[PDB]
Design a protein around this ligand. Structure first.
Ligand SMILES: [Zn+2]
Lengths: 1150, 50, 34, 34, 34
């Protein structure tokens, strides 16, 4: 199989191209050179060629897609009862799909996708010419020939994938931009997007300059917004970048966007993947990487002194946290000359405030053992996909034999097969990871075995850095050492760092973020945003050796941290340039400074992530404390936000200047030179979690997120739905996300399915409206969670959508049956219900694979040759899970919402989670397979055949007439024959019916929820805030038991099951919130938990809709109750388990 | 007073421990610094787990 | 246990006994470079 | 009747401490002078 | 049975007197080297 990837997932490399142009003598070279024109472009200039691709206008008949999208959105809105905005939504979609430029981009995306599909996973290796507009593609092995008229560019399949992904991202960007503009106060801004596209595509500067511009677009936009809307602190961030010099047109366009709306500028400027990715200059990039891993900014002696200072502050913070959490000092030994205050504080077991500014006093305090190193990592970390190298002897397997032979003139002594696994999961299966304490024993001593001292650096894909950034894949032993050290740091010491502890407790985190949002606008809390660039290639052994020693003594693991603290100096580093291999002298790499480097001062990116965080927090606390300013360090990565509170003595400007100077000075004494462009101060803009915040209100990522095993239609649609759901969870409007997702879903269906299905508007609509809940492809339509935050039953919503479709459009019920094609399972499958309470017992035909759990489990049980796995799978976990599910399926008031709860706190749930981790590893599933190429072809054929069928599944007439609540309960009764109760949640739309009170009649006043607006709302109000209002499975089980007893649920059988669950463990005895702060609640309810929150969200969504539809509210509006049958009284009688439990227990897990 | 005269020995031990650890830090870094670019072996710096 | 706390002290010293020795070898072979 | 045989090692301990410090400065100043 | 325990400790201490002076010259002649 050739050309496996269907999307850009690897860095763009050229060394292969250069090797094939001049070197190499394989048969494919003759064919390749034959099909190269005189004007052969370089691979580094591939984007200069794909920009010229033009397709004939309106080649794909996508009008059916337009009509289907219109109908789908109309149906969704009508179901939601927001009939005053369907006009806006479907008009926007039609305009988006009818624009000339937008349609051209969409057609280009479709052509790219079809060309990719026709060649990926092809056993053939010389696919003939393929026409793409004026280009004539041609594939050879993993190389591509692209010709337009006379110029050609010998590429790699990765380059073509990058071009295809660029076209796809531009399609997404344009569609989302039009839809978003249709729903804003300020009109369509699509023209600016098109203008930016044309301007950037018109850039003819060299490779490096063009990609510098593209990289700088976003930070320069931040600087532009910042320099205009700072009130307290100054700003010069925009000055550093050279955009206004290199590309004046882009600068003028960006300034125009800023003038229009800063939020819009941050919106559009955030796109960074919709522009062709660079080709890493591997020679220079690797040379720079290796040099940066061996440079000494600071003298080692000064670094060691500062390391001692950092050790002092680390001791201070740890002791403070330990005291605050246990009201007693940890075991410490006081050195001679210790200060009297320290003695008194230790004796009294308290923490005097004076220490906060006197960390130096802790230089005489040594912390003794407080825990033991957990040299037994849990499966959550071992079972992963991070590629690893088995040992040194496998280094020869990361290069091409032909390239090595040509470059040096000598063969490569590659053994017949790799001596060991290629990934962590394979290592675990093979039994390597069963005596970890012995595996890490060399680290304890301090002499890592020579066989485990090699590191391979890998370039990072989809990064706009021509020089490139490398992350490191490392030997199995070093990888396990890292895992153990990271777990220990994150579990035993990091929670005790008082100042740093308040950045991981979500409660404190959320409270701090809310306070920052409330105070940023008032001009009393500005933020400093440091973004280290050399952080990864930073820390030297000297700086961290003292803290490494203190940790070693703290965990009683002799020299376990110091060994990795000084390891890089004894390690061999190589660059995976598959066609630029290093020389091999005696079976080992030879240092040359470009491809190989034996011994460096740091272990590179990824390694010691947490320790570096601790050190950074330490020196930041030092820098800020000495100037006596309140601070709230907030950050985890190389970019950190420092929140500084106003001081009554001096204005924010002087405070910011002093803080920045101190940070410069102290980062200077760490070998972490901090430059101007990496730090900026602002009182209007700040960033956290890769998510901007302008004047407190978040900047939606509509244009960015919506622009984001073997492949299959189901997998692609699921990824689309998940991305759109994440965007909706962000500050993106639910309507923007929903419309964009509908458009994208229709495009995706158009790419795959044959014309017969596509040109069937009614069928296409029905397909888009049949969600997975009733059995069908994932769709953005059927998603109640888009508009809500809590758990919600999707079934009533799906039935409501189908009912509305039937009532409104010309689709007949027989067609719905044809598409839905209901197929009740022959026998109950209790495990599926337990692991997903709100699902019907139906055959999920479109699912990529069903019952595969036993296949993976069975494959793991055999062909293992391990010990941990053997004890982990003594008897089939799937069979026991089914047993437990059946056991829990004997509650006379069968309430799956609790069956899932009970099943959750059992060892079998953890075992199924581990199996899920195993299958998630694409290596395990491929190992289980016993190719995938035919599997996809068969899969595509089956679905294409399935819906082309004209067979019926089950007469749905009785299930699409009444309340979706009652209908859903009837459906569950039918599909399990047990009158399932306790999980159906009504649909807010049918439960109520919004009414404006302008025309309200006395009949409507009897019962409803009223919404009182303080003043008339407007589009401006939608973006400005107002004023109106392990063993832990034992504690959760205990609180569940306390919950039951408090409610007086005391059942002998349930008690026995719960006690068994205990003894097997060992124990024995925000989108709309801004408007929400603009209205007032109403508790004047008669009947009606969490569901009420959904009603409130719907009520305020009505106002959002009427405002966004060019309307205004003059009087309070009510929410009458329309469907009475959608109301019920719940008693929750008891969990009468009936038949006695038979699960027993595992006792092997944990 | 049979134990107080012993605790001061322990503190004397712990004081030496820091002395040894500082020696190790310095010596370890000297050797590591000269080991860059050479095939110098990675000598152990701690006897063994008990 | 009055004698155990000193018993543990012994082997704690024994760790130093060779902890230097392994430093002695590395320092000694450092001379051979010069 | 046994404390008399332990006061003679602590007095020697101090004598062995002063040597340890007496060489501490010697070793440290050697690192800086490099 | 402490008397034997003391003596074994005492000899181990005597292993510190000669070992150090067996490396005092070694480490200090490094200064003579530089
Ligand atoms: Zn109803």
């Amino acid at each position: 199989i050739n050309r496996t990837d269907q999307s850009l997932k690897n860095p763009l490399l050229g060394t292969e191209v250069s090797f094939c142009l001049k070197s190499s003598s394989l048969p494919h070279h003759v064919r390749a050179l034959g099909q190269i024109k005189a004007r052969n472009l370089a691979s580094c200039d591939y984007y200069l060629l794909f920009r010229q691709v033009v397709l004939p206008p309106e080649v794909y008949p996508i009008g059916v897609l337009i009509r289907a999208a219109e109908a789908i959105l109309t149906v969704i809105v009508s179901a939601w009862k927001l009939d005053h905005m369907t006009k806006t939504l479907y008009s926007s979609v039609r305009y988006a799909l009818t624009n000339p430029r937008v349609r051209a981009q969409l057609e280009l995306h479709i052509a790219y996708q079809r060309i990719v599909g026709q060649v990926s996973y092809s056993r053939e290796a010389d696919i003939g010419p393929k026409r793409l507009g004026n280009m004539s593609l041609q594939f050879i092995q993993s190389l591509v020939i692209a010709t337009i008229d006379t110029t050609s560019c010998l590429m790699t399949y990765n380059h073509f994938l990058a071009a295809a992904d660029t076209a796809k991202s531009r399609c997404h960007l344009l569609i989302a931009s039009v839809v978003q503009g249709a729903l804003w106060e300020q009109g369509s801004f699509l023209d600016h997007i098109i203008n930016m596209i044309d301007i950037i595509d018109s850039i003819n500067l060299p490779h490096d300059d063009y990609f510098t511009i593209i990289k700088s677009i976003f930070p320069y936009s931040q600087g532009l917004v910042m320099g205009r809307h700072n009130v307290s602190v100054s700003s010069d961030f925009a000055s550093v970048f050279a955009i206004p010099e290199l590309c004046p047109q882009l600068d003028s366009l960006l300034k125009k966007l800023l003038q229009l709306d800063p939020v819009l500028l941050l919106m559009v400027s955030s796109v960074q993947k919709s522009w062709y990715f660079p080709e890493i200059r591997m020679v220079d990039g690797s040379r720079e990487q290796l040099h940066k891993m061996r440079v000494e900014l600071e003298t080692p002696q000064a670094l060691l002194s500062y390391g001692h200072t950092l050790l002092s502050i680390f001791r201070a913070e740890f002791i403070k946290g330990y005291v605050s959490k246990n009201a007693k000092w940890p075991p410490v030994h006081l050195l001679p000359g210790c200060d009297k205050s320290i003695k008194n504080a230790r004796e009294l077991g308290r923490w005097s405030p004076a220490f906060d500014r006197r960390w130096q006093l802790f230089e005489k305090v040594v912390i003794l053992r407080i825990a033991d190193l957990d040299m037994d990592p849990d499966f959550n970390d071992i079972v992963s996909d991070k590629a690893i190298i088995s040992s040194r002897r496998d280094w020869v397997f990361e290069y091409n034999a032909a390239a090595f032979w040509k470059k040096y003139g000598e063969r490569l002594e590659r053994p017949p097969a790799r001596s060991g696994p290629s990934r962590l999961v394979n290592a675990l299966i093979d039994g390597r990871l069963d005596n970890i304490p012995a595996l890490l024993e060399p680290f304890y001593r301090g002499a890592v075995e020579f066989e485990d001292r090699l590191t391979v650096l890998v370039p990072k894909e989809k990064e706009l850095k021509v020089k490139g950034r490398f992350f490191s894949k490392q030997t199995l032993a070093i990888r396990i050492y890292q895992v153990v050290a990271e777990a220990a740091l994150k579990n035993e010491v990091m929670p005790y760092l008082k100042t740093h502890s308040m950045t991981m407790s979500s409660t404190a985190l959320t409270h701090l973020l809310n306070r920052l949002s409330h105070t940023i606008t008032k001009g009393d809390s500005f933020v400093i945003n440091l973004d280290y660039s050399s952080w990864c290639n930073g820390f030297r052994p000297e700086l961290q050796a003292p803290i490494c020693r203190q940790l070693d003594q703290m965990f009683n693991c002799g020299y376990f941290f110091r060994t990795g603290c000084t390891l890089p100096c004894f390690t061999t580093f190589i660059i995976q340039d598959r066609f630029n291999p290093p020389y091999s002298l005696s079976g080992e790499p030879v240092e040359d400074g470009v491809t190989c480097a034996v011994g460096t001062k740091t272990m590179g990116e990824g390694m010691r992530q947490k320790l570096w965080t601790i050190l950074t927090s330490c020196w930041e606390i030092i820098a800020l404390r000495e100037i006596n300013v309140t601070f709230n360090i907030l950050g985890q990565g190389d970019n950190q936000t420092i929140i500084i509170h106003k001081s009554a003595s001096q204005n924010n400007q002087l405070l910011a200047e002093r803080a920045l100077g101190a940070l410069y000075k102290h980062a200077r004494l760490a070998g972490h030179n901090l430059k101007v462009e990496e730090c900026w101060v602002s009182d209007c803009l700040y960033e956290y979690g890769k998510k901007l915040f302008f004047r407190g209100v978040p900047v939606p990522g509509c244009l960015k997120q919506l622009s984001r095993l073997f492949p299959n239609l189901y997998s692609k649609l699921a990824c689309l739905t998940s991305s759109c759901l994440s965007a909706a969870m962000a500050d993106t409007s639910p309507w923007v996300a929903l419309a964009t997702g509908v458009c994208l879903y229709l495009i995706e269906l158009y790419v795959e399915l044959p014309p017969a299905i596509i040109q069937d508007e009614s069928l296409l609509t029905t397909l888009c409206l049949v969600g997975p809940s009733i059995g069908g492809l994932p769709t953005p339509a059927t998603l109640p969670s888009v508009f809500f935050r809590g758990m919600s039953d999707p079934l009533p919503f799906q039935l409501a959508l189908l009912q509305t479709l039937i009532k409104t459009t010309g689709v007949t019920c027989s067609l719905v049956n044809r598409v839905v094609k209901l197929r009740i399972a022959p026998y109950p499958d209790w495990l599926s219900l337990v692991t997903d309470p709100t699902s019907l017992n139906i055959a999920q035909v479109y699912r990529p694979e069903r019952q595969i759990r036993r296949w993976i489990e069975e494959a793991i049980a055999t062909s293992s040759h391990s010990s941990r796995i053997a004890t982990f799978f003594q008897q089939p976990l799937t069979e026991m899970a089914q047993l437990l599910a059946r056991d829990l399926s004997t509650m006379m008031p069968l309430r799956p919402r609790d069956m899932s709860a009970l099943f959750a706190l059992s060892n079998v749930a953890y075992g199924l989670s581990i199996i899920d981790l195993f299958q998630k590893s694409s290596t395990v599933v491929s190992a289980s397979q016993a190719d995938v190429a035919l599997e996809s072809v068969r899969y595509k054929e089956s679905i294409i055949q399935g819906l082309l069928d004209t067979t019926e599944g089950y007469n749905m007439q009785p299930y699409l007439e009444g309340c979706t609540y009652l209908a859903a309960k009837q459906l569950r009764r039918l599909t399990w024959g047990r009158d399932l109760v306790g999980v159906t949640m009504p649909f807010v739309a049918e439960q109520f019916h919004p009414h404006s009170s302008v025309g309200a009649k006395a009949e409507l006043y009897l019962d409803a929820i009223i919404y009182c607006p303080q003043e008339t709302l407007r589009s401006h109000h939608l973006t400005t805030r107002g004023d109106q209002p392990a063993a832990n499975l034992v504690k959760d089980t205990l609180v569940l038991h306390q919950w039951y007893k408090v409610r007086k649920v005391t059942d002998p059988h349930l008690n026995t099951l719960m006690a068994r669950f205990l003894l097997e463990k060992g124990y024995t005895s925000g989108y709309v919130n801004i408007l929400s702060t603009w209205l007032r609640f109403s508790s004047d309810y008669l009947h009606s938990t969490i569901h009420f929150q959904h009603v409130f969200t719907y009520g305020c969504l009505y106002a959002d809709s009427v405002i966004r539809s060019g309307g205004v509210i003059s009087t309070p509006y009510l929410l009458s109750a329309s469907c009475k049958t959608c109301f019920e009284k719940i008693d929750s009688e008891e969990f009468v388990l009936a038949c006695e439990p038979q699960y027993r227990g595992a006792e092997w897990l944990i | 007073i049979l134990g107080e005269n012993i605790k001061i020995l322990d503190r004397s031990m712990k004081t030496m421990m820091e002395t040894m650890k500082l020696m190790m830090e310095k010596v370890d870094l000297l050797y590591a610094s000269t080991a860059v670019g050479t095939s110098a072996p990675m000598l152990p710096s701690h006897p063994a787990p008990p």
